[PDB]
């Protein structure tokens, strides 16, 4: 009876959410036309978590599309698995943020965030028992960062008793896609730790590393990278949609992952990934997923997990498993290399079992890890912002909309607050 | 055995009252020829409310159409569903008032109002029991305002125990269709306060944004504007002509919505307004009706109901509905935001259910609101009338036909009386 509010923002968030509902509607068995055809009766039982019933067996997702350019909105609706969306939830501006956090958060986002708050409250009050507020956006962009974080800040005041996932990508250290990203990246973090209960940190260079080294694909497009995110984003709420021998909601993960409110950044992975060359050569077993699940190559964050110390963990297993095999490997990895784990917390890893696997896959799992390695991602952005703020470069756009350098000092102070607290916990 | 007489006045009245007779003839099931072609036997149960039996089974409406210009009846007879009206009811003039209230009320009306009370009286004692009269005219014009309100005054003298509906259209807030609109609006209000038992206000810009933003049509014409004007008037009398669980006759719409005899002006809103491209995504459930019914955008008056509370509300539900969800939604909206309701009347909202829905639709509602926010429609016209009169502008046309400024001072004196007493009960 729980349902999850999925909200999409920006160029990055909209295209991923097109892929997210592409696989979920296929996993639940409803066609791109909009008629349910899932042959398994267990999928139809829990349909209200992601789909609202409509006239004639029709289902529409509990999702919004929020952007400042009609280009992404037109691109989503044009392709397949885009017709299923709500026409009313396609809120859109005409200006375009254009990689400025001042435009997204304060000036041109303000006159059209009241419209997106109208359709969210319309959708929230229609459904029965709200579980969370899951957002998929970007941190280095301008459309999904400035308007998303204000929408994150605004939605926490309206419903202060709800969890929230942030599927927010991070600018990669090795390559860059925006010149003025660390102005925008740091200024999104400052507005994030005060209101986000947890964060699902993603990046793109790990997805290229996953799709090339492990899947053996020399030319990956955004169809490949957003499918892996879409595989994860269904896997987080796997226990809600289907029966399981040990279920877990969003708050089950939330209490089991953060010792403190401010240490709420994670790293995420997806275990059952095989190349087509090694399609027939990997024996799918409970030992084989977990030896790849804890591998450093499979993480979807820029951080190296072996450098940092894990603070907590979480496991979202899917399919028909023997829970002793699930519980043994989680205990085995804690005792094989305890130097890579925390010393002052017993039972570091949390587990859960969902009885229904995804389509095609016989077994799957999703790793959620709060570690001190996320500091290595923060301080890369932190060292870039200090070198760029000391001369106030690229700041006349930012201060032109009314945002003083005092807030920039406050953003860097809170940016240094995160890297201060994770580091001395690792000692 | 309750008979309703329909009266249309002027260019606006004869054109938009034709489309009211379009939808009732389409809903009761009679062809443009005049014979019955309905599917069910429920339509023939109460035909006497609007139509007269004649030779050959033909049903002639109880409608008198009257104006000072011959151009409208050229358009009325030529249009579809135009043959059904009796030509004896087609009383017209030769001069034409030309947006002047003085010519319609005093000079060129005097040789014709004696004729129209001969036509009304012939259809008065022809039927058994007069429930009352309904009129749909214009206030910005002059051939339906001055000629109309004199008829409205005269029928109350002759038939004082019967009830009046005035579906009067007011000047739009941001745009004006005629220059001398504030004069003819305020002089019509001064007559409609003491003569009309109740009044329902329609505004064209309130129809304009509805037909564009909510109905998602790029270019609605005037026929699209008059349809929602025609749809709401059929929702007024839905409980009369058809059975239901709880019946609200038109006297109920008067005795319940009107706390004090001067405070009788309403606002109206049609509930199920979804486009062709957005209907199949929407689930046709009574929660979806009640959220649209109470929306500010759905009202067909120039007022915004967030400015002023509702003194009394109504709802004319049509179809097969579960009355528990109907009752608890009105209870919820009374409990969600008690600020937006008048506190000193408990349970402000009336509901009545008609068991048969309109054509095509299966679940519908018709909101009647005696809100105190409609004083802004009075006040904006009142400040226009004071500004025009203080330079004696456009006055030699009016006073040259038998007017003096004593009524204009008196017309303002009742105009600002309404906004003063509407604001008084809000506090």
């Amino acid at each position: 009876m729980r349902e999850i509010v999925h909200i999409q923002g920006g160029q990055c968030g909209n295209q991923i959410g097109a892929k997210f509902w592409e696989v979920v509607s296929d996993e639940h068995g409803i066609d791109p036309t909009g008629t349910y055809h899932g042959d398994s009766d267990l999928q139809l039982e829990r349909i209200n978590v992601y789909f609202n019933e409509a006239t004639g067996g029709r289902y529409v997702p509990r999702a919004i599309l929020m952007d400042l350019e009609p280009g992404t909105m037109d691109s989503v609706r044009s392709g397949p698995y885009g017709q299923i969306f709500r026409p009313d939830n396609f809120v859109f501006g005409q200006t375009g943020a254009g990689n400025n956090w001042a435009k997204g958060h304060y000036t041109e986002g303000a006159e059209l965030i009241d419209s997106v708050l109208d359709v969210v409250r319309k959708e929230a009050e229609s459904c029965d028992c709200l579980q969370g507020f899951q957002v998929c956006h970007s941190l280095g962009g301008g459309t999904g960062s400035g308007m998303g974080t204000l929408l994150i800040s605004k939605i926490r005041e309206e419903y202060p008793d709800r969890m929230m996932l942030t599927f927010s990508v991070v600018p990669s250290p090795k390559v860059s896609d925006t010149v003025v990203e660390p102005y925008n990246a740091t200024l999104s973090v400052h507005q994030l730790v005060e209101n986000a209960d947890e964060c699902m940190v993603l990046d793109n260079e790990a997805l290229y590393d996953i799709c090339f080294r492990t899947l053996k694909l020399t030319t990956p497009t955004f169809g490949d990278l957003n499918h892996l995110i879409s595989a994860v984003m269904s896997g987080i709420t796997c226990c809600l949609r289907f029966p399981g021998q040990l279920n877990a909601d969003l708050r089950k993960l939330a209490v089991n992952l953060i010792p403190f409110p401010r240490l709420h950044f994670f790293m995420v992975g997806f275990t059952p990934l095989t190349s087509r060359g090694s399609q027939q050569y990997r024996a799918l077993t409970v030992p084989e997923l977990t030896q790849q699940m804890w591998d450093a190559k499979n993480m979807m964050c820029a951080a190296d997990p072996r450098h940092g110390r894990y603070l907590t963990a979480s496991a979202l297993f899917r399919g028909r498993m023997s829970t002793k095999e699930v519980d043994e490997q989680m205990l085995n990895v804690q005792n094989k290399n305890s130097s890579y784990f925390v010393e002052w917390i017993p039972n570091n890893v949390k587990s859960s079992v969902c009885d229904i696997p995804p389509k095609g896959l016989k077994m799957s799992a999703t790793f959620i890890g709060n570690s001190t390695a996320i500091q290595e991602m923060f301080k890369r952005v932190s060292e870039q912002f200090t070198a760029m703020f000391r001369r106030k470069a690229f700041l006349h756009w930012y201060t032109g909309e009314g945002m003083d350098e005092m807030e920039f000092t406050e953003a860097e102070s809170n940016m240094n607050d995160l890297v201060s607290e994770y580091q001395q916990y690792q000692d | 055995m309750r008979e309703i007489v329909h009266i249309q006045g002027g260019q606006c009245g004869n054109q938009i009252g034709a489309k009211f007779w379009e939808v009732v003839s389409d809903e009761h099931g009679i062809d443009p020829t005049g014979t019955y072609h309905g599917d069910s036997d429920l339509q023939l149960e109460r035909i006497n409310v609007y139509f007269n039996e004649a030779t050959g089974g033909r049903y002639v409406p109880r409608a008198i159409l009257m104006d000072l210009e011959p151009g409208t009846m050229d358009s009325v007879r030529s249009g579809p569903y135009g043959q059904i009206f009796r030509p004896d009811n087609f009383v017209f003039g030769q001069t034409g008032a030309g947006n002047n209230w003085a010519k319609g009320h005093y000079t060129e009306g005097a040789e014709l109002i004696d004729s129209v009370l001969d036509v009304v009286r012939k259809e008065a004692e022809s039927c058994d029991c007069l429930q009352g009269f309904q009129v749909c005219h214009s206030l910005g014009g002059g051939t339906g305002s001055g000629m109309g309100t004199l008829l409205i005054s005269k029928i109350r003298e002759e038939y004082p125990d019967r009830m009046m509906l005035t579906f009067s259209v007011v000047p739009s807030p941001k745009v004006s269709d005629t220059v001398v609109e504030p004069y003819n609006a305020t002089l019509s209000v001064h007559q409609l306060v003491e003569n009309a038992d109740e009044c329902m206000v329609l505004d064209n810009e309130a129809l304009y944004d509805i037909c564009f933003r909510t109905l998602k049509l790029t270019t609605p014409t005037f026929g699209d504007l008059n349809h929602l004007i025609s749809a709401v008037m059929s929702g007024i009398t839905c409980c009369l002509r058809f059975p239901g669980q709880l019946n609200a006759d038109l006297r109920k719409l008067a005795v319940n919505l009107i706390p004090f005899p001067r405070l009788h002006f309403f606002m109206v809103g049609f509930t199920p307004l979804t486009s062709r491209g957005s209907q199949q995504y929407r689930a046709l459930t009574v929660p979806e009706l009640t959220q649209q019914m109470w929306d500010a955008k759905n009202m067909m008056c120039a007022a915004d109901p967030r400015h002023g509370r509702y003194l009394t509300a109504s709802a004319l539900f049509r179809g097969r509905m579960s009355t528990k969800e109907v009752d608890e939604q009105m209870l919820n909206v009374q409990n969600k935001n008690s600020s937006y309701f008048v506190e000193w009347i408990p349970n402000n909202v009336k509901s009545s259910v008609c068991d048969i829905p309109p054509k095509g639709l299966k679940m519908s509602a018709t909101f009647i609101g005696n809100s105190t926010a409609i004083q802004e429609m009075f006040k904006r016209v009142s400040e226009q009338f004071t500004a025009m009169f203080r330079r004696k502008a456009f006055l030699h046309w009016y006073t040259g036909e038998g007017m003096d400024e004593m009524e204009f001072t008196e017309a303002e004196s009742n105009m600002n009386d309404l906004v003063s007493e509407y604001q008084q009960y809000q506090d």
Partner: peptide, 29 residues
């Protein structure tokens, strides 16, 4: 007005699942 009733190779997925998610047909190496 219809208020009665309505009466109305760029994506390159390249990922398929056959007991384990892989590539459909396109290329590898």
């Amino acid at each position: 007005e219809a208020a009665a009733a309505l009466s109305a190779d760029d994506k390159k997925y390249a990922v398929n699942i056959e007991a384990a998610m892989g590539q459909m047909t396109v290329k590898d190496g």
